[PDB]
Design a protein around this nucleic acid. Structure first.
Ligand SMILES: *OCCCCCCNc1c(NCCOCCO[C@H]2O[C@H](CO)[C@@H](O)[C@H](O)[C@@H]2O)c(=O)c1=O
Ligand SMILES: *OCCCCCCNc1c(NCCOCCO[C@H]2O[C@H](CO)[C@@H](O)[C@H](O)[C@@H]2O)c(=O)c1=O
Ligand SMILES: *OCCCCCCNc1c(NCCOCCO[C@H]2O[C@H](CO)[C@@H](O)[C@H](O)[C@@H]2O)c(=O)c1=O
Ligand SMILES: *OCCCCCCNc1c(NCCOCCO[C@H]2O[C@H](CO)[C@@H](O)[C@H](O)[C@@H]2O)c(=O)c1=O
Ligand SMILES: [Ca+2]
Ligand SMILES: [Ca+2]
Ligand SMILES: [Ca+2]
Ligand SMILES: [Ca+2]
Ligand SMILES: [Mn+2]
Ligand SMILES: [Mn+2]
Ligand SMILES: [Mn+2]
Ligand SMILES: [Mn+2]
Lengths: 231, 231, 232, 232
DNA sequence: AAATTT
DNA sequence: AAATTT
DNA sequence: AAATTT
DNA sequence: AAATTT
C-alpha cells in the first residue's frame, strides 16, 4: 500500500469508521481514521480556502479552512514526518463521492517546500485543458471554466456518485533530509463544494505520498481516494 | 518604555538576572529574563545562522541557531503576539558589549511577513555605506566589508566594550490583524562573533518593537540594547 | 524640483502639452511630455491591470495595461535609469482630476526590486486598511474605503470630485541601481477602477519612481497628474 | 529532432561551424550556429554566474555571465519564443567535452517562470544530493560529488575526461507561453566552475529549453554541446 | 440531519 | 593556435 | 569558565 | 470634442 499523510475536508460523517457526527477537517496519518479532527461548518455553494503548514522545528502539521465573513476551522497534530514519509514524495489533491455526491472543484492550488537552501514553489490560479505539470488520476479533469474537477460532473453540471480522482504535481518533492537545519512546506487551495442533495459527500484532501502513489482500487466514498480500507 | 519581543543569542551568563550558567538562546517577551532558553555552543570566529519563525495558527515563536557541521540549538515558546505587540511594528537586530566584548557582525539578514494576502519581504546579503532602508541606532555602522557592525569595532579590528547598536528595517510591518485568517513571519540572519578575550559578551538579538523604538539609555552589556532594566 | 520617472495611464488628452488625441499610456522621463505613448482603450467602470518592468541588461522600461477579454496596450522606451534616477528612490502611485473627473481607485499593488550576492525587496497590497502605516499618503489619497486606496477625492456614495490630487508612496526607500551590481531589475503591478459620469473622464493614474523626499508639486492637479510642477 | 533554445557558454572556438576565434556566450535558436555571440573572458578554475532573462513584452532573450571583480559579458537576441518553442517545455543544463576537456561543474541552479490571474513555477538548487529525484540526468551527468552537479565525466581526484556529454533537466514540464496570457516571463541563474589542464579548454555549458521528451542527440559530444544532432 | 428502535 | 598543404 | 569562600 | 475666432 502507499504511504499517505493527508488533511481531509470530510463533508460526510461515516460514524462506523470513527468520523465525528458532523462535517469535520482531519489530519490523516496512514489511516482514514483521523489522528485529530475539528468541526467544520461547510458552506454548500461558497468558495472556501484551505491552508496547510508544517516545519521541522515544531513538527506540527496544521490546517485552517475558512469562508469569507465566517469563523475558521483549524486542526493541528504533533507528528515527525521524517518517521512517516519517504524522503522524496509527490503532493496532491484527492476527492470522492459515494451514494451521496458533491462537486469537488479546485479553483487554485499553491505549494512551497524549503530545505536549509533548496526550494520548490508552484502556483495554479487556473487549470488548462492539457496541464502537463499535473498527473490526473481516476475521474479528475482540467480545462472546464479553468478549474480542476477532482470527481465526475455530467454535461448538465450535476455531480456523479461513486467517483474518485486526484491531481498530483509532476515533480517529486524533497520533503525531509537528515542533513537539513530547517525544512518547511505550506499548501493553499480554494475549492467549491456544491450538492443538490440534502447531504453532500464525501470530501477533498490535500495529501503527501510515495512518488508512485495511485488511487487504491474501490477508494470511492468514505476512503476519499487515499486508503484501500477503513483500518 | 518600548514593547519588545526578541530572540537573544546570549554569549555571556548574567546569573544575577536569571541567565543560565552557559551561553544560551532565549525568547524574550517584554523582559531580558527569557521566558525560555536552550544551551548554545557558540563558536568564536565561525559564521552562524539564526532562523526565527512564528504563525497565527500555532502561536509558537521558534528559533534555531547553527554552525556548519555542528548540532543546532533550538528554543520555542507558546505566546499569542496579538496580546503582546501593537498591530504595527518595526523589526530589527540589536547587539551589545559591556566589560567583556565581541564583534557583533551581521553578514546577511532577511525577513518575510504575510497576512491573509498582504506580504512584505526584504533580503540583505550585503550592506552598503549609505543603507537608506535601515535605521542605524547607537554604534551600528554599515559598509565595512559589506557587513553590518552592530557594535563599535576600532580601526585595528578590535571590538570595544560598553557598546550598543541596532539596525531596524525602515518600513513599519503589519505583524497581526483581527480580520486575518493566517499571519506568519520568518527571519534569517548570518553573524560572526569573534572575541580575543577568554570570554565574549554580550550577544545579538532579533527583535520586534513599537515603530518608534530607540535604544534605552544605559542598555549596554547584559540588557542587549533592548531593555532599560533587568526586571 | 523632484526627479520623476513614471508610467502614465492618461485618460484625458491635453493636446496643448503634447498628449495624442485619445486616452494613452506613456513613459514619462522627468517631463509630463511622454517620451513614448500608445493608444489605450480605457473601459469606464471596469477593473484594469497595469504591469511595469525594467532590468539593467536591456535598459528598457516597458508597461502593459489590460482589461479581461480585451486587447492589451503596451509601450516601451530605451532609457538607462542609472543616468536619470538617484541610487535610492521611493516608488508610488499618483492620480489627479481637474475640470473633468474620475475615480482613481487602486484595488491591489505589488512591487519587487532585486540587485545582484542579491539584495531584494518585495511588497504586495491586495487590501488597504484605514491605518496603512507602510504607505505615505499625500494630498487627497485615502485608504480603508472597501479595502481600496482612493488616490483622489470621492464622496460617501463613491462619486468622484474635480480639482483633486493624491499619491501613495511605499514607506521604505528602494535601492533601484548600484554601479557594482551585475543585474538590477524591478517590476510593479496594480489593479485599478476608473469610473466617471463625464463625457471625457480625467486625468489619469501613474506609477512613479522619485527622489526619496518627493512631494506633490504645488498646483499639480489635472494634466500634471500630481507628478510635475509644470508642462515643460 | 528536438526543438532547442539555448544560451551557450562556449569555451572552444570551432571556426568550421561559425564560432568566433575566442571563447564566447551565444544565443542558439534551433542551431549550434549562434544567432548572436559576445566575447567571454572565461577564467579557468574560478566560480562564474550566468543570468538568463526573457519576457513576452520585450520578446528579447538576454544573458549575462560574470566572475567576481571582472567585467560581465552580455548577449541579447530579439526572438518571439511563441513561434519557436512548444507551449510546454523542459528546462535544463547541458555540457560536453571532445578532444579537449574541462570540468563542467554546476554549484547552483534556479529557475522562475510566470504566466499572467497568475501561474508560477520556481525551483532553486544550492546543493545537489546523490539521489536528486526532481532532476532527469542524461549521459554522463552525476550529482552528489561535493553537493555539486557534474554535467560531464570527471575522475575520483576531480580530473576531467574527453569525449563526455551530460544534461540535467527539471522533472516537471514548464508552461513557457500561452496565447491568452497578458505577460509571460522566465529567468534562470546558475553558478559554474570550468577548470582544465588543456591549453584550450572545451567544449562549454548551455542552459536550454526543449520539447518535454528531449534526449542527448546521438554523437553530440564536443562542439554540439549535447544539444544538436549536427552543425546545420 | 432526521427518523425509527430499544 | 600551430603545422602543413597548395 | 575558573578561582575563592563557606 | 465642440464652439468660437481670425
Ligand atoms: O450532519 C449529518 C448529515 C449527513 C448524514 C445524513 C445521511 N446519513 C445517512 C447514512 N449513514 C450511513 C453511511 O452510509 C451511507 C452510504 O454509504 C455510501 O455513501 C457514503 C456517501 O457517499 C460513503 O461515505 C460511503 O463510503 C458509501 O459509498 C445513511 O444511510 C443515511 O441516510
Ligand atoms: O561559561 C562562562 C564563561 C563566561 C563567564 C566568565 C567570566 N565571568 C565573570 C563574572 N560574572 C559577573 C558578571 O559581571 C561582569 C561584569 O558585568 C559587566 O560586563 C558584562 C559583560 O560585558 C555585562 O553583561 C554586564 O552588563 C556588565 O557590563 C565576573 O565578574 C567574571 O569574571
Ligand atoms: O476626441 C476625444 C477627446 C478629445 C479632447 C476632448 C477635450 N474636451 C475639452 C477641452 N479641451 C481643453 C483641455 O483643457 C480643458 C480643461 O482643463 C482643465 O481640466 C482638465 C481635466 O480635468 C485638466 O487636464 C486640466 O489640467 C485643467 O484642470 C475642453 O475645454 C473640453 O470640454
Ligand atoms: O586563439 C584561441 C583559440 C583558437 C583555436 C584553437 C583550436 N586548437 C585546435 C584545433 N582546431 C580544430 C578544431 O577541432 C579539433 C578537435 O575537434 C574535437 O575536439 C573539440 C574539443 O573537444 C570538439 O569541439 C570537436 O567537436 C571534436 O570532438 C585543433 O585541432 C587544435 O589543437
Ligand atoms: Ca467521512
Ligand atoms: Ca547575558
Ligand atoms: Ca493628459
Ligand atoms: Ca564551440
Ligand atoms: Mn473523516
Ligand atoms: Mn540571557
Ligand atoms: Mn499624456
Ligand atoms: Mn559557439
Amino acid at each position: 500500500a502507499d504511504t499517505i499523510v493527508a488533511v481531509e475536508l470530510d463533508t460526510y460523517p461515516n460514524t462506523d469508521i470513527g468520523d465525528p457526527s458532523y462535517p469535520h477537517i482531519g489530519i490523516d496519518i496512514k489511516s482514514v481514521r483521523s489522528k485529530k479532527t475539528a468541526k467544520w461548518n461547510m458552506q454548500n455553494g461558497k468558495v472556501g480556502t484551505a491552508h496547510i503548514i508544517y516545519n521541522s522545528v515544531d513538527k506540527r502539521l496544521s490546517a485552517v479552512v475558512s469562508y469569507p465573513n465566517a469563523d475558521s476551522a483549524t486542526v493541528s497534530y504533533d507528528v515527525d514526518l521524517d518517521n512517516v514519509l519517504p524522503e522524496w514524495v509527490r503532493v496532491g489533491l484527492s476527492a470522492s463521492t459515494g451514494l451521496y455526491k458533491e462537486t469537488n472543484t479546485i479553483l487554485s492550488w499553491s505549494f512551497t517546500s524549503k530545505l536549509k537552501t533548496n526550494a520548490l514553489h508552484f502556483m495554479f490560479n487556473q487549470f488548462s485543458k492539457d496541464q502537463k505539470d499535473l498527473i490526473l488520476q481516476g475521474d479528475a479533469t482540467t480545462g472546464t471554466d479553468g478549474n480542476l474537477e477532482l470527481t465526475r460532473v455530467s454535461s448538465n453540471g450535476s455531480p456523479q456518485g461513486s467517483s474518485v480522482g486526484r491531481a498530483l504535481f509532476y515533480a517529486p518533492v524533497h520533503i525531509w533530509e537528515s542533513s537539513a537545519v530547517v525544512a518547511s512546506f505550506e499548501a493553499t487551495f480554494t475549492f467549491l463544494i456544491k450538492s443538490p442533495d440534502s447531504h453532500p459527500a464525501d470530501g477533498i484532501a490535500f495529501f503527501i505520498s510515495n512518488i508512485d502513489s495511485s488511487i487504491p482500487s474501490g477508494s470511492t466514498g468514505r476512503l476519499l481516494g487515499l486508503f484501500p480500507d477503513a483500518n
